[PDB]
Amino acid sequence: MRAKWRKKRTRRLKRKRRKVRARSK
Amino acid sequence: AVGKNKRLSKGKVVDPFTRKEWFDIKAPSTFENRNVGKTLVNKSTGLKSASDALKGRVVEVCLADLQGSEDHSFRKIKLRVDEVQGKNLLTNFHGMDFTTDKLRSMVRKWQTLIEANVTVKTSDDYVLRIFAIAFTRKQANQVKRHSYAQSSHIRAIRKVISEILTKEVQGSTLAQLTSKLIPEVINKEIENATKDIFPLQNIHVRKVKLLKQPKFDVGALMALHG
Amino acid sequence: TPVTLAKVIKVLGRTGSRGGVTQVRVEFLEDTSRTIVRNVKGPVRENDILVLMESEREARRLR
Amino acid sequence: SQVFGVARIYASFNDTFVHVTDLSGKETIARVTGGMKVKADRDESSPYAAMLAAQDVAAKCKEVGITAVHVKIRATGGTRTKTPGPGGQAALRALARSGLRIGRIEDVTPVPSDSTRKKGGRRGRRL
Amino acid sequence: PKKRASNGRNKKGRGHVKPVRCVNCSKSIPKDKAIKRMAIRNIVEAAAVRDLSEASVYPEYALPKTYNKLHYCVSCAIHARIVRVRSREDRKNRAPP
RNA sequence: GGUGAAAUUCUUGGAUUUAUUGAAGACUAACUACUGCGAAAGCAUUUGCCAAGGACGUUUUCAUUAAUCAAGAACGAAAGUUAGGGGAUCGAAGAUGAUCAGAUACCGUCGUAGUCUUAACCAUAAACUAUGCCGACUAGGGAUCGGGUGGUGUUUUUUUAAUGACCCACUCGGCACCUUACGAGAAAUCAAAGUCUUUGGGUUCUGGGGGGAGUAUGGUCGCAAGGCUGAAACUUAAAGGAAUUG
RNA sequence: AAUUAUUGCUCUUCAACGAGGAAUUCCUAGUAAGCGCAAGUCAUCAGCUUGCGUUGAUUACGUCCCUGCCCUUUGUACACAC
RNA sequence: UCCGAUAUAGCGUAACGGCUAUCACAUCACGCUUUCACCGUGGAGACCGGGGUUCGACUCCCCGUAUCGGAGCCA
User: How many CA atoms lie within 13 A of A20 on its CB side?
Assistant: First the structure.
């Protein structure tokens, strides 16, 4: 529900897509 | 709560009041009633020297008790034991204080509180911190309800009060200054100077505290107790 | 044994959490013109005389 | 004509302290708390427990030589509630009956000039 | 929708109020939004003045009182049989009872 | 000691408590307000120094030098980051005692980072009055803050004066408040959210049903955390606002 | 038709119960309480019920303290309505 | 080998030689809540073992049992 934790959840996934992508470039 | 202690000794009877002796506190000469109270201490044993443990006690007593009359009812006075001999141990001035309920009565809203302190020393090498408190008052025939001060009267009032306290201490060593607070004469002087700035009711000055002392001067103390 | 006979002039009303205490403005029989309020347990009418072991306990008033 | 002590009644919540000392305050007489007279671990601050504790202080005063007392009522103070506990009044109430003479009742609750911080967090104590 | 014109508080022209702590739960609350109530009772109590005065040296000297100012948060104030709730019309009333 | 009740915990090695001191760091109570200052964030102990600011008074001076603003720039709560100092309280994390069917939550006791400071980043907030700035006009009323004007007014100096504080009247500027609706609005409400179909005073920014989505990608800034800019595919007939009765 | 005695009568047998703990029911005047009678169900069987009469107190003449319910205010993202 | 310490309901725990021994938890029942939790009311459960002292031992002395700590070793 809470938009505070969907912002937090997305930010933690921003880290993952940014860290898994560094393995290529 | 009674049967709750689990362990009383980390490792694993004689009544003490029969071993104690009673004295009587003597107030300085600048007080109406020399009789103050009564204390306790063990006998002067071969190692403890119970006269020594009784040397530095500090007792606080109301000024109404010392002066008899109940006008000076709040006015807490602290007396410090300086010399003991012949079971009439002698005490000297140690500081004056206000009762909490008196201080809280004066502080009411819709009026300005003014405070002022100085660190002026006396002629007998005593060092004190005089505190002064005052409250703005609503002049007669006033309509508005608060009557605050304009934050420049306060600076002028605080400058006037600080100047008065320093001058009124230099020259008064211990005795006349103690006999200056008892008859409430300093505050009457404060009102006279500040009556041209702002009304300022309730100029009961404040508590006073000692900071440091010179050499004992045993003869000076004996000059008070006759 | 100080015993005071006091005669009531007014029944203020019931009081207490469970409504078992009555408030009464009661005058003293002797030394008239000095009165007191006293909690009363049982039923009382106007101009009834009471017995006291304390004369000047002022019961609290709900006002 | 009177031997005067200082009551120094400290009645916080969860307990109540009453212990009379000498005028100088360095020699104490018969310190008994509210948790010494009842075994509940919950009625330590109760008015009944303080009533029993006050009588013991007053009783032991007679055999020592204290016939009058100066009352100094105290709350926890500091950053805590600063209000007297439930047993503060009963302790003062009870010792008057034993025969001690009262004088110069005064509140000695320590009050700060906006001191450090109060425990509980920003959102208080959630209940 | 807006429920109050002041909306909780007395902040018009400050922007910040330097909050104080509640007395029951110790919750942060701005000073203006606080619900300050003053409690000034006698030290002993209203009905106990005999037993202290009956056994009192310095007869009827002052019988002094205790002064302290209490701050509650809105949650603690409502729960404590205080300003609890008023109807929509009576919410506008500001005068004390 | 703590709690609704407890327990973890400290205690005959003297805990809690009382008294006399000493140290450290933080904070600035009560006074404290429908009160003040600041562009906002914000700012509450005394004093000294430095520079700054509004309003008022003005028969002083200049003379249209102005309003709003892409780009660009200064400041920017808390949290967070880098490096020293400090590190008392409280205390994300963590450890424990409970409660619970479970409780890595609420509650209790500890407790690092942090909380304070110096130098440097960050550039965010329900950063809200959810109400851009400037200008003019439209109903009354009292209160208050600052400045000014007048009154043989009151009080105190040396009865007396100039003063200081008050009282009355007026005026400028300000934080606000009360009543009403010619007026507005969907209403709640609003002296502006009024002078808008009888539609045009000047100007900047932003929105175009709801999700996907402030997401993906590309730039740019940042030590990092992240900030700014910012879709499409796809999916849907409702989401949403204010009030009424239950 | 009575055997797990339908009930009535006689004799003998003569058990807990020494006034009842935490709780909880009913009750304001002929009311409570004591006592019995008629009817109901019945071929037989009242320790039940519906009514009736005899004797017949104390304590209130109030309160919202506990419990239950009603009204108002209040919040709502419920309307098949917690 | 010596010295010292420990040994009570299903768990923990304290003992005055004038009592086959209190408690909180676990349960037996009855309670109070729409219901589930908290809370209340009366029991059953116990002294490591064996001897001696004693008008009267859980409790005072001796031995053994199991555990723990510290000390020393010419068959």
Answer: 5
Phi-psi label, residue D14: left if phi above 0, alpha if psi -120 to 50, beta otherwise? left
Contact between B42 and B56 (Cβ < 8 Å): no
Resolution (A): 4.8
Cβ atoms within 10 Å, residue B74 = 21
**Calpha distance C25→C45 (Å, rounded):** 12
Report yes or no: B25 and B38 within 8 Å, Cβ to Cβ. Answer: yes
Give CA–CA dist B180/B117, Å, rounded.
17
- CB distance D19 to D58 below 8 Å: no
Residue B169 DSSP one-character state? H
Report the C-alpha gap between B29 and B27 in whole angstroms.
Answer: 7
**How many CB contacts within 8 angstroms connect chain B with chain E?**
17
B2, B25, B99 ranked by CB distance to D23: nearest? B25
Helices and strands, number each (H, E), in chain C: 0, 4
DSSP β-bridge partners for residue E20: E29
Strands D68-74, D101-107: pairing is: parallel
Interface test with D, best of E27, E61, E69, E75 (most D CBs within 10 A): E27
Residue (of B60, A11, E84) closest to D23 by Cα position? B60
Quick one: how far is CA B119 from the chain centroid?
A: 15
Domain layout of chain E by residue ranges: 1-97
Residue ranges covered by each domain of chain B: 18-226
* D111: its two tokens: 């009050």
Cβ–Cβ under 8 Å, residues C27 and C8: yes
Q: What is the rounded distance in angstroms from the CA atom of residue B155 to the CA atom of residue B200?
A: 13
- Provide the H-helix boundaries in B40-99: 50-53, 63-67
